[PDB]
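Exercise: predict the structure of this protein bound to magnesium ion.
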Amino acid sequence: MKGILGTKIGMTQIWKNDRAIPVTVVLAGPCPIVQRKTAQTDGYEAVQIGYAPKAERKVNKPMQGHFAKAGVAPTRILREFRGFAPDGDSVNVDIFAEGEKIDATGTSKGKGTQGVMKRWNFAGGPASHGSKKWHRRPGSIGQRKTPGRVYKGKRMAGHMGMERVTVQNLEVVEIRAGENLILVKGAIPGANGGLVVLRSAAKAS
Amino acid sequence: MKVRSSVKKMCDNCKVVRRHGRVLVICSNVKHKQRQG
Amino acid sequence: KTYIPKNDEQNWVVVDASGVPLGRLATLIASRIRGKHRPDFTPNMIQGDFVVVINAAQVALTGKKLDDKVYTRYTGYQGGLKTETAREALSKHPERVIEHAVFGMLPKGRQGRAMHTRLKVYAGETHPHSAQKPQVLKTQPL
Amino acid sequence: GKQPIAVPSGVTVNAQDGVFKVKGPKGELTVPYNTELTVRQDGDQLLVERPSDAQKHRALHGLTRTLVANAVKGVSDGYTINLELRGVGFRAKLTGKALEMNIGYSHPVIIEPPAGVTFAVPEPTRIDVSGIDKQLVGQVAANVRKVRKPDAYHGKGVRFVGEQIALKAGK
RNA sequence: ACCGCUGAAAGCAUCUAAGCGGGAAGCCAGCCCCAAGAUGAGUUCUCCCACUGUUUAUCAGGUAAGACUCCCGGAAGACC
RNA sequence: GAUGUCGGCUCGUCGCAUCCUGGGGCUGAAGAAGGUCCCAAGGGUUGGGCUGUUCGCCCAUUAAAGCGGCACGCGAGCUGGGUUCAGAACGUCGUGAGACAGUUCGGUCUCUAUCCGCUACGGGCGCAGGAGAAUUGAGGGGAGUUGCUCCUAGUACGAG
RNA sequence: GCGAGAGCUAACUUCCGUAGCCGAGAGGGAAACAACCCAGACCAUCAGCUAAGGUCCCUAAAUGAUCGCUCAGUGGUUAA
Ligand SMILES: [Mg+2]
Ligand SMILES: [Mg+2]
Ligand SMILES: [Mg+2]
Ligand SMILES: [Mg+2]
Ligand SMILES: [Mg+2]
Ligand SMILES: [Mg+2]
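Solution:
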């Protein structure tokens, strides 16, 4: 529910007490609140937030109108957050607490066309005792005369990566408001300089 | 529970009472409990 | 030789589903949708009326709603893509119970498919009055 | 068969339509039944007449009469079940409206009663369930009985005060 | 499955005949991802705004908001 | 005028008469460990030695090391050890040429996918004006395993 | 189908006897369907009656009349 938008900065090594901690640095920059979705107006409850600034010249006439209505500044990234109704213009301070478990989401790094061995952890085959199918190649796609078809969903080579990925229950190690930073234990999906969506634990333990 | 496909009278205590379209037996002695599924 | 048609008419009927046995109600709707008493009486096209169903949630079913009435609807390649729901469990979709019983008694071709546009089901009483700016000639079952 | 109904003082059977309503001094207790069978006050006492004499009508007869007598004896004096805990260390207490038992399990069992039903404890090793409807009192007491059924080797558990239990005994 | 409450037919008894409760790694829902070609094609915000063309060429043609084309690149990518 | 045949590998999916795990009933169930039957197919179901072996036996573990179906599932997917081509040997049979219930060593497995099917990705048009953007979720897919240790408690139970 | 042998009083099995159909037989019915059921197509008709089979909607025609049965979706998977 209570969420924000940021940018993956990098990973570093940090200590808390006597133990080292791998940390992903997120610049969870200030988010203008740009549209309040109400059951009365939209049919569901949500908030449209904004992220990186955009030069006024780069902004088209229709997007200018959408921003001018809320009287903000044009952004570039616009996302909603269901059931989260704050007051003012969204920043991590007081939103997230040091220690709080969070749900980091982004777009995985894309690996293009990837065959069954990498894409699905296949096995491929013998590298030596007679082959033409040396390592990658799937085996049998099916059976015989029976479902003279191949099962829908059959794990096959395709475009791997560049998908939405949510990583549940990540520790909030440190927070540097004003610097608009948030240290998170572990690995968030996507590449550095990528959009990230940090929110309240989907369903906490 | 002794699931016997042929439930018959054993002693004067068993009461044959049907349940959800199946023959079931309720008795005082725990061993006497007979059913069909 | 035999007489053919026109289309200047598009009769809208307002059947109430309240307490009517499902198939018994269904029959009436499917017949008024195809061409029962039929305007010019022809089958190369749709002469049928635009049935509007109200009180879908209050429809009647005999001995079993809990048991027997099971809507099997098996998804993509059946990799156990076998989905089943009890008729009681259709508290989620009352409108699809009437809908997917009436379509069941309609022709199935190019035209037949065109005919499901005519049926317009709603679970309410006063709230269905959405598609109720054209005609509202109420016809009872039996 | 089932025919005579004793209706003392504060009885007010307003059996209009399908709702065979019964108002009395111990709150208002409603009870629904079949309309196909007849029921009304014949001067001083009450009677539940049956039409057909096949079997489906016969079965509902004895049932409809007992249930009205149950609802009558209900608003008249009332219903009250006496339960007894047994076994070393077994005990029950009160937390407002809820009953709290400490009966051998790692954690203490708590039971919040439904509407019209009341829990009572005289000595901590005895439970009392009292209310209006016979069914609700019957269930609530059965849920308390469920918390621990008396075992076949020692009879430790929730029993019916003057309840007789057979004892298997192994070693 | 199973355990029970109220309880007749069968003046007793009965978890059932009518009703009601509880009960599984299974069912539906919840978690993550796709998803209105959901032709039944949904909703919300914002923008541009009513242009010209002889009964001889019955809709084509300037245009708006906006985009594409081309260029330099990319933790995007076979090409798109 | 040809439906490639054992085993392996690869890849799966499905039945339940369930090997484990979940819920129960009875027990010659004190407890702990079991037995047996009922409900239950969500996931899981190890690595080696011998043999072409499936099977099976053993080693060492495990919650468990399930039984079956899918042309004894799968060779336009791979292998080629077994069997059923041509060489050669042994035993045996036949006077012989040869032969098998056999046994032994050797012995070519055919670059290009048209349709359906399956995985990814675009072009077109539709969605009653032309556009930029945020979206609800009908529907669908993924996921679903389990041990050990401590606390309760050395309590219940048990003569111990 | 009926009457037998063989066979397991198995086979869409085999071998006889006997009738009928398919073979060489279209049309209606039996969802579909050589054989079963009805019925043997000279051609034409935007006429009528019937067979077996049917008459809720898909689908032609009584959601027919009367006295009953079953409440298991039996109907619409077999026995001790
Ligand atoms: Mg390898
Ligand atoms: Mg093949
Ligand atoms: Mg429950
Ligand atoms: Mg062969
Ligand atoms: Mg068990
Ligand atoms: Mg017989």
